[PDB]
Swiss-Prot record:
Annotated spans, Alpha C-terminal domain (alpha-CTD): 4-84
Lineage: Bacteria, Pseudomonadati, Pseudomonadota, Gammaproteobacteria, Enterobacterales
GO biological process, one term: response to heat
Name of the protein this chain belongs to: DNA-directed RNA polymerase subunit alpha
Entry keyword set: Acetylation, ADP-ribosylation, DNA-directed RNA polymerase, Nucleotidyltransferase, Transcription, Transferase
Subunit relationships: Homodimer. The RNAP catalytic core consists of 2 alpha, 1 beta, 1 beta' and 1 omega subunit. When a sigma factor is associated with the core the holoenzyme is formed, which can initiate transcription. Both the N- and C-terminus interact with different regions of transcriptional regulator CRP. The rRNA transcription and antitermination complex (rrnTAC) consists of RNAP, NusA, NusB, NusE (rpsJ), NusG, SubB, ribosomal protein S4, DNA and precursor rRNA; S4 is more flexible than other subunits.
Residues of the full protein shown: 246 to 329 of 329
Keyword field contains Methyltransferase: no
Length: 84
């Protein structure tokens, strides 16, 4: 039986970051936990609206759930029903 990680398809809002951190991530097309864990710190800090404060918060909230940045995933993005 193949194994997957359901947490990856949770929206970034389930992490309960600060409104600012959440809004900054969405602006970078980072809408799910799977999108976020794939980005790296260097890459994130390079974005217009994110600083050290936010990155510290983000690394902290992710670690609290056994996650991190720079995570390699397999078979992303999550499955969807194809249109007709
Ligand atoms: Na997939």
């Amino acid at each position: 039986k193949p194994e997957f990680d359901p947490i990856l398809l949770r929206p970034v809002d389930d992490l309960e970051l600060t409104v600012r951190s959440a809004n900054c991530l969405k602006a970078e097309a980072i809408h799910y936990i799977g999108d976020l864990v794939q980005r790296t710190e260097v890459e994130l800090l390079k974005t217009p609206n994110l600083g050290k404060k936010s990155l510290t918060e983000i690394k902290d909230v992710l670690a609290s759930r056994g996650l991190s940045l720079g995570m390699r995933l397999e078979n992303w993005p999550p499955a969807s029903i194809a249109d007709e």
